[PDB]
Amino acid sequence: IVGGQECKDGECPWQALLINEENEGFCGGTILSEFYILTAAHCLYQAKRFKVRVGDRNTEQEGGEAVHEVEVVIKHNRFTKETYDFDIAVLRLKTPITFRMNVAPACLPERDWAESTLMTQKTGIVSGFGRTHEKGEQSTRLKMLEVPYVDRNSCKLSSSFIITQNMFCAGYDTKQEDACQGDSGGPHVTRFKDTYFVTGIVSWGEGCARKGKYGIYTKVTAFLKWIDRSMK
Amino acid sequence: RKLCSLDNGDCDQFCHEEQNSVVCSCARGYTLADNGKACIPTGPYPCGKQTL
Ligand SMILES: O=C(CN1C[C@H](NC(=O)c2ccc(Cl)s2)C[C@H]1C(=O)NCC1CC1)Nc1ccc(-n2ccccc2=O)cc1F
Ligand code: NA
């Protein structure tokens, strides 16, 4: 996360972190329930063996932080690096998460209500332990960042790659705030009356916080049914 | 003739227009209140709520 601020206690409880073998987080995830984490399909190709940590906010102090092995990985069959289209996956954990301080699931919204009510808000919230500068280092602290929804037309113009209807853009033209490397797979959530609903998955960007470029997110409304089926 | 486009049909969470009226509903882990508008958590860690 470039810009934004550290999540305060209890504020980003659906945040999960994908940790490789050398125990370093490389992607984020979103807690959807006790057994399932939402993440980006493209994260899967940055580790053959990885686990999921929850409850963390500072990777420099080690209570409540907890690691979970992944039992089953459900990658979208239509994902591909060529396009980054369909950039989504669900993980089943081998042992269930116990919800507690800093560990709770985000809500899956109903699709049409989310399109007409969540996606039409001004901003959503993205969070992660990813790099705090494009070339910087990952943050030991969980951070969050308010990101404006950006109009699909503008993002298309702004972009050097094809933005599909399974993607949306959020962020800033020039302001130095964005998600970044290491945030991929993590939550984009939209608050509606004190409740936070999953609206996006950090997916990709040309750099991080670049001028004239935005954050690109998997559009969760496009896959609410797919997640449902993946979780059953 | 009621709409979700005005104060979300007075719903706490999901709103749909049904037979010229609004019907509210809630995410899993919540039960719709008797008043038909509010969403009442059924456990202590309902989705989408910060653990404050
Ligand atoms: O592959 C990267 C790598 N990057 C991704 C990362 N930024 C992000 O992941 C995000 C930014 C904002 C959001 Cl949201 S996610 C920064 C930078 C990096 O890792 N530099 C490492 C190098 C040392 C500098 N970006 C990327 C991925 C996919 C695509 N892409 C999109 C559509 C079609 C094909 C395609 O390749 C374009 C890209 F520019
Ligand atoms: Na930008």
Side-chain angles (χ1 to χ4, degrees):
Chain A
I1 298 296
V2 178
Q5 49 179 175
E6 311 195 338
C7 294
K8 304 149 157 94
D9 254 323
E11 289 189 336
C12 301
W14 32 77
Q15 182 76 51
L17 174 67
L18 306 194
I19 59 190
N20 53 32
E21 286 191 69
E22 281 205 75
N23 259 8
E24 285 142 53
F26 62 96
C27 266
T30 300
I31 301 164
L32 310 181
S33 67
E34 64 199 357
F35 282 112
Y36 292 100
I37 310 293
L38 180 68
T39 184
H42 84 256
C43 285
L44 312 183
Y45 300 92
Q46 320 176 162
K48 278 153 192 158
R49 306 182 256 167
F50 69 89
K51 287 183 195 174
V52 180
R53 197 195 293 168
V54 300
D56 213 24
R57 274 177 68 236
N58 192 339
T59 74
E60 256 169 48
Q61 37 212 66
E62 271 217 17
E65 133 186 358
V67 176
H68 287 258
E69 297 177 34
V70 176
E71 174 182 294
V72 165
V73 185
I74 308 153
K75 186 178 48 120
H76 205 293
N77 66 202
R78 293 180 67 186
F79 172 74
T80 165
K81 283 130 295 194
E82 155 208 18
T83 62
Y84 266 60
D85 205 3
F86 289 95
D87 190 7
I88 192 189
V90 157
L91 320 176
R92 193 192 169 74
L93 299 172
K94 287 173 195 153
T95 48
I97 303 193
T98 292
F99 295 146
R100 64 208 180 250
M101 170 65 48
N102 283 300
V103 192
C107 304
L108 292 164
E110 189 273 312
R111 182 214 174 264
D112 299 350
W113 180 84
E115 286 283 305
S116 64
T117 311
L118 292 174
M119 304 301 289
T120 48
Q121 309 274 307
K122 275 159 187 177
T123 67
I125 299 298
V126 55
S127 55
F129 298 95
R131 302 193 164 175
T132 54
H133 175 273
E134 190 176 326
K135 290 123 166 143
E137 292 185 344
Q138 307 210 110
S139 166
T140 63
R141 317 259 162 116
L142 185 54
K143 304 172 58 179
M144 44 164 281
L145 169 63
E146 188 152 33
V147 286
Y149 279 104
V150 173
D151 143 70
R152 169 159 316 261
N153 278 344
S154 300
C155 189
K156 286 196 189 197
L157 290 165
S158 77
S159 186
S160 303
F161 305 86
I162 290 181
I163 308 305
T164 69
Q165 284 291 335
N166 297 306
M167 302 165 198
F168 70 94
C169 315
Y172 296 96
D173 199 340
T174 48
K175 193 173 181 187
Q176 295 298 287
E177 301 198 302
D178 202 1
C180 201
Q181 188 174 27
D183 295 323
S184 273
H188 178 281
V189 301
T190 307
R191 170 173 43 78
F192 183 80
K193 304 188 191 199
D194 310 338
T195 304
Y196 288 82
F197 299 88
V198 185
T199 36
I201 293 154
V202 176
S203 180
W204 61 272
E206 300 173 43
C208 305
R210 281 189 201 166
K211 291 206 201 66
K213 296 293 178 262
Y214 303 99
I216 315 310
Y217 295 79
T218 307
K219 182 201 294 183
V220 178
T221 48
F223 299 102
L224 283 167
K225 298 183 153 205
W226 180 91
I227 293 169
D228 227 295
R229 300 185 305 233
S230 302
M231 291 180 60
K232 281 164 170 151
Chain B
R1 204 217 174 185
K2 209 192 198 325
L3 319 201
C4 298
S5 49
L6 284 187
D7 302 314
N8 196 40
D10 295 323
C11 307
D12 269 9
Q13 289 180 19
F14 314 136
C15 185
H16 313 290
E17 283 143 39
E18 197 135 44
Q19 306 299 343
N20 276 214
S21 189
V22 157
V23 163
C24 303
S25 53
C26 306
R28 165 196 161 185
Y30 288 89
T31 311
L32 193 60
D34 292 344
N35 71 8
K37 306 192 181 189
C39 295
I40 297 175
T42 59
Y45 296 102
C47 64
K49 290 303 180 173
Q50 287 163 333
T51 55
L52 296 166

